[PDB]
Write a protein that binds this ligand. Structure first.
Ligand SMILES: *[C@@H]1O[C@H](CO)[C@@H](O[C@@H]2O[C@H](CO)[C@@H](O[C@@H]3O[C@H](CO[C@H]4O[C@H](CO)[C@@H](O)[C@H](O)[C@@H]4O)[C@@H](O)[C@H](O[C@H]4O[C@H](CO)[C@@H](O)[C@H](O)[C@@H]4O)[C@@H]3O)[C@H](O)[C@H]2NC(C)=O)[C@H](O)[C@H]1NC(C)=O
Ligand SMILES: *[C@@H]1O[C@H](CO)[C@@H](O[C@@H]2O[C@H](CO)[C@@H](O[C@@H]3O[C@H](CO)[C@@H](O)[C@H](O[C@H]4O[C@H](CO)[C@@H](O)[C@H](O)[C@@H]4O)[C@@H]3O)[C@H](O)[C@H]2NC(C)=O)[C@H](O)[C@H]1NC(C)=O
Ligand SMILES: *[C@@H]1O[C@H](CO)[C@@H](O[C@@H]2O[C@H](CO)[C@@H](O[C@@H]3O[C@H](CO)[C@@H](O)[C@H](O)[C@@H]3O)[C@H](O)[C@H]2NC(C)=O)[C@H](O)[C@H]1NC(C)=O
Ligand SMILES: *[C@@H]1O[C@H](CO)[C@@H](O)[C@H](O)[C@H]1NC(C)=O
Ligand SMILES: *[C@@H]1O[C@H](CO)[C@@H](O)[C@H](O)[C@H]1NC(C)=O
Ligand SMILES: *[C@@H]1O[C@H](CO)[C@@H](O)[C@H](O)[C@H]1NC(C)=O
Ligand SMILES: *[C@@H]1O[C@H](CO)[C@@H](O)[C@H](O)[C@H]1NC(C)=O
Ligand SMILES: *[C@@H]1O[C@H](CO)[C@@H](O)[C@H](O)[C@H]1NC(C)=O
Lengths: 323, 170, 323, 170, 171, 325
């Protein structure tokens, strides 16, 4: 009579690497590396992302006339730019501290847009109806940004304007404006009358003064002039005051901001869908409890840690020796 | 390889034994059979389950991480940000892969150790009431019915009881 | 029967450790690697006490906000402490240019010699030196001003051009601070400085600026629609700094000759300062430990154990304990 | 355990043996007692001391490290600074916790091995002059006085000396 | 060591066995000599070669890395850059040193294990046809010429063939 | 007295030692070093291309064309750029080189260029003075001089009319354009040089746009000059145009650089001698020739190098504990 000691074998074809030898077949193992996603852009906390489409952040917040679909946007789980996100500033110029504004937006989960300076009643002594350009066309006609107002001389006079807004919204307000720089002194005169024009913007914390920089530049979208774009975050209770004798592209609409965490701006050409996820990448969503993933380093939500690995399989059972 | 049992002095595994990782094959008059060892297997299961949960537990999930943008006069801080992202990624990739390699070696050696310990356990129960073959098998010097076998498996084998019979046959 | 048994030690230890295969293993001996104790006090390093800013911050200290008078004598410290109430900084509203860089500079200063760079009573014979006070900087019931700067105004109905240089003969870097005032109106400009169109210029071997007042009413802060910007520079040994102005200069009065040292820093803490000594300081308290790790605070001054998020790091030295 | 001695074929430890980690308990006609094994315990103490010191020595101390301040237009670099601090903190917490976990496993197994090897050393000294009980104990076939016992403890047991007596009784 | 053989029950090494890591010394009427065990030696070489290569493979090379410069008003970012460079250097120095320490231990133990398993392999082939001395040696209870020795070395020793001769001499 | 077989292991005369967790300095029969600590003490070619030796010049002195840096006027391609501890010729006229560190960062991915006369001196400026813009601060060979790659324009007669001058980039690659803005110490010197008290300089391309206005302040002499000049640069993309407009104070581009981008280059500081050898890996101390994973020679490297660590030894055991006794 006999008794033997022995160990399990099965038909497992799972392999793992060890330090002394590669590709060892084991009876059981577990994969620690997620390499699968659903190829879509989903909701988080059941909230849909904001798809900018052919627009970028600048085109959205300024209201580039190509971005009118976004006018209604007010809340999102994250923001999506695409490979075709080219509509931003349609009048050439510099968007001052643009990358910083993008970083700010990354912690904004919603806003309420409102008419900070109503076009019809804010500017009785200035022309509000002629500030359009072929650089920002819409429907084959010269136009302009929807959230800013290009003020010009009424008749032959641009009197000193002074306009203030007090922030009674109970939260931060994002105010955007521009300053225009004609290419010639006669153009400065046509638009604004005053050769020695200035723009001054002040709040409790912001304080800047701008003067026209008149010079011929290479034409960009037909324009030898430039417009620089500016922004500030006005704190609850604070006031912002504009004073100008020309060259002000005035705020028309502004944005009362709601801060939230875990949001962000991603770049992706993946389709938006009605599904819901805990973890989103620019390639697609992940539904996994595995500790690692090799899908993408950019993530929104709660995700496995990105690593460059192709295989992370941990042995749990033993060397498989079925002979 | 470390403990000499798996792929060693016990040359091969048993596809016939499906209810556990380690166990016994017995053969007597009353029949032959496979029987997993509940205790050794279960201790191996709790151990490995703990190993896996511990590996996973050390790995913080990743919360929102997205890109930053930089203008054409911020190339130094753009390159710094890139040095930071690439450097952390090199380190985590290294840590993940190395932890899996080393732990896999340890896990296979652990199973080897469990088999070996089970073997020597049985060998200490039986002593001279059986002879060792060299391949994980013992030949008894007495009749060991399924009651006796069972005793050998659950560690209650009574040596003195059969010591005389075995001495005789031996 | 005659016998010998081989065995191992057991004791009454209740020390537990974690291993990969099993948690809370009781072992006969072990060593804790994790420091979790501190004394709850801010202590001296190398026998030198920290500088407690108290209700002031770094700006209030260096400018001499009138609420910061207890710091007027401070000259050396081991590290600098701000508190949750370090609120007194710039009392007249405006921007402190490169303020964070100045804080970083002061982080590697271990002492200084404060000196009267331009004595108030003798430096400014053609200008008014006694009227430069403001309700924005009130102290003890009266309008006042920074102790380390001097607000020059017109003498009678005249503010003639001033020109004033200082040569650095201190044998080390000198920190010089000044301001430029921007009134809210032409009326206040003329009232303070007489000259409607004024400037301030500052030059050294490395610094070069002409400042022009920017006259505009901003929202009132601390009762002021005007603004004052604050500037600073480090003058190298042997270099000269030259100030010229026809108005709007908040002149240096006191400057600081800097001694550089390493291992210093600024921390924020509400823990009390005490006459104790340490080699390692955190914002929660001092640490006296030769252990490799601590979970007390990531901010440390001195020679400290490495900060980790762990609650337990216990290394087995002895064996499994089985009594 | 990996080597099968501690909490293994030697069920438990000795609160009676206070002067070392490993050793012997004997009973002869002269009396009983515990005695630590100097050689084994000491080698283990040197090894463990070295392991602890190596771990500590690889962790170079933290020198002055304080927060940085950033203005309201420096959010990108403020966030970069935070990413760097958190990232290094993740890595060091991971490395500390993991090093202690893995080394703790190794230390326990080192001890287990030291006990196994001590038992095997005695076993090959004694050969068939004693019978193995199986619980870590040997019963001699001859009289083994305090001097004989001491020779077993210090590795200089004279097998031939007692082979004839032992055969007789065996 | 962990497995008790090297510097253990086999007290020292053999400078006379030059063509392998583990092996055999024999003595019989025909003569004396050393011979490496090819199977165990080659298995160890393969393992260790794989270990070294796996270590190197996880160390992707360093491409161009040159210093960044900062002006006198960029002290915070200069210091951030230094914190990053120092932090990564601390980590990589730590990983390289520790990996070498731990793996060196594992490697010596792997050798100790291979010697122990080779010894136990021979022991179980020979059984009671030889007596264990204790120092890694076996004395045959039967004559064992060169062909017989080679059978022990290549793992084909025939215990039953020599059992009767052995039993006569053992008693 | 029977036949015998013993089991045993290799020993040899190796003296190699390794450290382990439990024990230091263990002698082993075989081992491999993973730490490269040897270099050849020289600066070598990479891909068979020599480095550019700035010598007594720095990158500012090279690009602006400090007259002391004339030996560099012919440099056109390099594998990396070498500054030394005596690289002090740069901005001979005192002032600030704006975004200089950014320019240095850009140059780290430039492997060659073609210098060209962007605005030829003799024909570009018919209404301004082109011959009087020299200074003792930039003296060469016993005479007042100036940067070779810029041109200090001043008033002709009693007038400085508005200039406007454009360059279209037809080079098929990025063009690095440098210019300067002079800041006199007094309003009087402003008038004497440029006539217009209210002067400006404007520079614009499709993407770049900046206005510069003299900042006139009394200030000390540096290299004999109370004036300052700020130096500026921009990268003009293929097909784009740059336009300079000024009513004074412009230090005009004269020569500019069409750049070729290439990876894995950079700027190092080293006093080691350049030699005619080739390497895969260069550090400031010397070149490395090694297949090892780690090195402790230098954290700065160019090419494909082992990883820098602070370790003084990294030796892996491969063989066993060596016990010849
Ligand atoms: C929303 O975003 C879109 C996409 O970016 C913009 O559409 C582009 O507008 C630009 C600017 O006008 C167009 O670029 C211009 O193209 C002219 C001809 O382009 C050729 O190729 C296109 C596409 O293949 C053809 O449709 C076209 O018939 C031509 O064959 C050029 O003449 C222009 O060059 C001149 O001006 C530029 C300065 O801007 C100079 O640098 C040049 O040297 C030259 O003098 C110019 O490059 C582009 O074609 C449009 N793309 C598409 C896909 O439509 C929208 O305008 C934008 N809308 C808003 C309001 O933001
Ligand atoms: C030293 O620091 C202390 C503590 O920070 C500081 O005392 C604080 O001063 C301010 C004075 O502005 C006080 O806050 C004010 O409270 C009044 C009364 O309720 C408000 O009306 C004020 O708001 C008006 O003005 C604001 C602009 O400044 C407007 O935004 C607002 O709409 C109103 O018009 C203002 O909030 C605060 O109460 C005290 N606190 C204490 C503890 O005394 C002190 O002034 C500092 N001293 C110096 C010289 O730095
Ligand atoms: C090229 O670089 C060299 C080396 O730096 C420059 O030469 C150095 O020029 C400085 C400034 O003129 C000299 O320092 C000065 O010396 C005089 C006394 O002789 C003193 O009065 C000044 O205050 C200052 O200390 C320095 O001596 C001189 N060194 C050498 C080695 O000659 C040179 O000017 C540079 N040339 C150009 C065109 O960039
Ligand atoms: C192994 O067994 C399963 C069922 O237990 C069977 O479905 C499968 O085909 C087999 N797999 C392999 C790899 O042989
Ligand atoms: C994700 O997978 C789990 C289990 O695989 C499942 O229960 C859950 O419904 C899935 N969730 C989504 C959003 O796909
Ligand atoms: C544990 O044992 C030691 C040694 O006998 C003794 O000093 C100590 O007081 C004991 N502690 C406890 C908690 O029993
Ligand atoms: C092993 O040794 C025997 C006896 O010397 C020999 O005849 C046989 O061919 C060998 N087998 C192998 C593995 O080559
Ligand atoms: C060690 O051996 C090598 C050849 O194997 C020989 O060249 C060298 O001289 C020897 N060294 C000693 C210690 O004699």
């Amino acid at each position: 009579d006999t008794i033997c000691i022995g160990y399990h074998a099965n038909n497992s074809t799972d392999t793992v690497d060890t330090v002394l030898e590669k590709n060892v077949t084991v009876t059981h193992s577990v994969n620690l590396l997620e390499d699968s996603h659903n190829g879509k852009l989903c909701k988080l906390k059941g909230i849909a992302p904001l798809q900018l489409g052919k627009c970028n952040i600048a085109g959205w917040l300024l209201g580039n006339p190509e971005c009118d679909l976004l006018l209604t946007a007010s809340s999102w789980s994250y923001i999506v730019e695409t490979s075709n996100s080219e509509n931003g500033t349609c009048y050439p110029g510099d968007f001052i501290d643009y990358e910083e504004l993008r970083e700010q937006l990354s912690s904004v989960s919603s806003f309420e847009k409102f008419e900070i300076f109503p076009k019809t009643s804010s500017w009785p002594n200035h022309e509000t109806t002629k500030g359009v350009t072929a650089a920002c066309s819409y429907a084959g006609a010269s136009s302009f940004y929807r959230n800013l107002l290009w003020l010009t001389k009424k008749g032959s006079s641009y009197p000193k304007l002074s306009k203030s807004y007090v922030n009674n919204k109970g939260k931060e307000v994002l105010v955007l404006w521009g300053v225009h720089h004609p290419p010639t002194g006669t153009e400065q005169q046509s638009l604004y009358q005053n050769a020695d024009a200035y723009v001054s913007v002040g709040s409790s914390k912001y304080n800047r003064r701008f003067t026209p920089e008149i010079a011929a530049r290479p034409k960009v979208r037909g324009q030898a002039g430039r417009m620089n774009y500016y922004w500030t975050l006005l704190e609850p209770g604070d006031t912002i005051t504009f004073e100008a004798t020309g060259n002000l592209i005035a705020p028309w609409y502004a944005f009362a901001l709601n801060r939230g965490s875990g949001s962000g701006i991603i770049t992706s050409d993946a389709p938006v869908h009605d599904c819901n996820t805990k973890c989103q990448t620019p390639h697609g969503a992940i539904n996994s409890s595995l500790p690692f993933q090799n899908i993408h380093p950019v993530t929104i939500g709660e995700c496995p840690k990105y690593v460059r690995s192709t295989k992370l399989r941990m042995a749990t059972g033993l060397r498989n020796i079925p002979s | 390889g470390l403990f000499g049992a798996i792929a060693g002095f016990i040359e091969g595994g048993w596809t016939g034994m499906i209810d556990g990782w380690y166990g016994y094959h017995h053969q007597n008059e009353q029949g032959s059979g496979y029987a997993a060892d509940q205790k050794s297997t279960q201790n191996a299961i709790d151990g490995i389950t703990n190993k896996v949960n511990s590996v996973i537990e050390k790995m913080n999930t990743q919360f929102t991480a997205v890109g930053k943008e930089f203008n054409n006069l911020e190339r130094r801080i753009e390159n710094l940000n890139k040095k930071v992202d690439d450097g952390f990624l090199d380190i985590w990739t290294y840590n993940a892969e190395l932890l899996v390699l080393l732990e896999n070696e340890r896990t296979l050696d652990f199973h080897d150790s469990n088999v070996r310990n089970l073997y020597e356990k049985v060998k200490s129960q039986l002593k001279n009431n059986a002879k060792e073959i060299g391949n994980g098998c013992f030949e008894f010097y007495h009749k060991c019915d399924d009651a006796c076998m069972e005793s050998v498996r659950n560690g209650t084998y009574d040596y003195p009881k059969y010591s005389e019979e075995s001495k005789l046959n031996r």
